[PDB]
Amino acid sequence: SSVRPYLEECTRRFQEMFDRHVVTRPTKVELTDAELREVIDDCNAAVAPLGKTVSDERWISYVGVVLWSQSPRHIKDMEAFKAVCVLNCVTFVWDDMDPALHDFGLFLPQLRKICEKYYGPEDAEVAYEAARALVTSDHMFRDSPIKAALCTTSPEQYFRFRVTDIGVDFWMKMSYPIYRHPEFTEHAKTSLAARMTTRGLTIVNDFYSYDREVSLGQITNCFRLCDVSDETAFKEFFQARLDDMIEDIECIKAFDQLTQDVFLDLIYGNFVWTTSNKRYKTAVNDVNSRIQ
Amino acid sequence: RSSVRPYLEECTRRFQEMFDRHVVTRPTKVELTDAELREVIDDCNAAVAPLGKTVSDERWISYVGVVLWSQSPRHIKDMEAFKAVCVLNCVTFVWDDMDPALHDFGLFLPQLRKICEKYYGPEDAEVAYEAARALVTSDHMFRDSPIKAALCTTSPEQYFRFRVTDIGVDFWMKMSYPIYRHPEFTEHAKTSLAARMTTRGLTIVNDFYSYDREVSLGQITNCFRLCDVSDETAFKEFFQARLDDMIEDIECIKAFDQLTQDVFLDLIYGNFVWTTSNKRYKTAVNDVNSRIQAAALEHHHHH
Ligand SMILES: [Cl-]
Ligand SMILES: [Cl-]
Ligand SMILES: [Mg+2]
Ligand SMILES: [Mg+2]
Ligand SMILES: [Mg+2]
Ligand SMILES: [Mg+2]
Ligand SMILES: [Mg+2]
Ligand SMILES: [Mg+2]
């Protein structure tokens, strides 16, 4: 199945929601040519031991989420920003890989190397533990009955799994040094930051990555909880997901001004990147194909 | 001055009937030797001494009973880690019960690190310490926060999201995995999936039995404040929805590997057994659960 017949209307509805509840639009970070090459060279070095090449185009597709979904008004540490570019991208490769290619002995040291290059010692350990936890989770839940149970039971069980699985807990734990903002740092470290933003990131990603995922047998997508071929059921389900995003956004507005800017730029930036990037244009292309 | 007292007997029976149907295996209490209990209590007293308030042996024993009842003794391998959880649980319970004027991070964080370094190896000590630091910092920073109000009053979903950290269950998991030395459990503890799976089962039970105390102290972190407890129909509807939440989580817990699900279910059910037997939840204000207060004239010369 596919959600293509709903693409135009659902995009309009997401956009209407953002226009009313978030208003401020995300802004894209411009890296210099030098900066982008440093990021790509670090990405290539980290995945090369796994034996698969990743094209410059595929790296630029992956990196766009970081470019669009941070909070430029508040950025203090551009070395931390580059780290998030690299770490996001290389864990994206692992997400797209056949688990036969997962080699922890070769990859975990590369993740440590990245963290120690860009962060102070304490932040490096926090970022590295979160990266290690994410790639371990992605690996251990391929073909797991736990994943089946959490993804097929209810939206609540599913989003609970996604706090880690989508990578948002990792994101917050590698991004707080960008801002050096004490309250944001605490919400990152308790994972309240990831929990506040999981549904807004996941409902958007799930809608636009559905066609790819169902074609690959991937079950981690909330729209598989409804019959997408039943337009009535799909619309009621979609509305319930919009309601979840709105409630989260309204509660995010209770956080301090800087933290809420970061959280909302993340959710909205992810929507802008997702709806423009080649990764989500088609189910199988040269930036999203399974790495085998 | 609202209360769930009229519902106490029926709601206890309904929780018990749920456990008898869905969990079955009863929790079992760990017996510590006298020396082990004294080691724990001595470490608890040392850790809280810098904060300046005496804690009786009776109060420590009240706090420690949750660890004695809600771990998984079939699977315990590291009793040093188990003693650490006893101590860490207890001393963070004191912090939970304290007025925030008593909260001295400069004095207390080193004592948390000392406990962790005594009982865990170097990596585990860092994980337990960071989780302890995160919890006590969260408890303090949310005492008067608009964020806590928003999350606690909006919906059950926002509320249980706050409680993953606030009830202390993420801390519990991150300090408890060394007890079991079980790879899968360790991973679920470190992603917090373990905490997320068990939050509702712990929090719904705790909230029902701690409501009367919490309302009397103006504490808003309780899901039963989302309903009008004086309206029997509204209360029973809300209570039923919370039981459904517990049952859905328990059924998905049973998809985890056998040892991990044993530990998660012993935590949820053990907490219920301790909560429904312990003096801490028998009345709203007593000498094991009273607010630990800073005296306004602590500095006065007539002391
Ligand atoms: Cl999947
Ligand atoms: Cl409270
Ligand atoms: Mg994935
Ligand atoms: Mg994927
Ligand atoms: Mg997806
Ligand atoms: Mg309390
Ligand atoms: Mg508390
Ligand atoms: Mg309570």
From Swiss-Prot, chain B:
UniProt-annotated binding residues for Mg(2+) 1: D96
Q: Name one GO molecular function term.
A: isomerase activity
What InterPro entries does the entry give? Isoprenoid_synthase_dom_sf
Per UniProt, Mg(2+) 3 binds at: N206, S210, E214
Q: What is its EC number?
A: 4.2.3.146
Report the Pfam families cross-referenced here.
Terpene_syn_C_2
Q: Which family does it belong to?
A: Belongs to the terpene synthase family.
The record's misc note reads:
3,7,18-dolabellatriene produced by the Trp288Gly mutant has potential antibiotic activity against multidrug-resistant S.aureus (MRSA).
So what does this one do?
Answer: Catalyzes the cyclization of the linear isoprenoid intermediate geranylgeranyl diphosphate to tricycclic cyclooctat-9-en-7-ol in the cyclooctatin biosynthesis pathway. Cyclooctatin is a potent inhibitor of lysophospholipase.
Q: Assembly and partners?
A: Homodimer.
Q: Identify this protein by name.
A: Cyclooctat-9-en-7-ol synthase
Q: Which organism is it from?
A: Streptomyces melanosporofaciens
Query: What gene is this protein a product of?
Result: CotB2
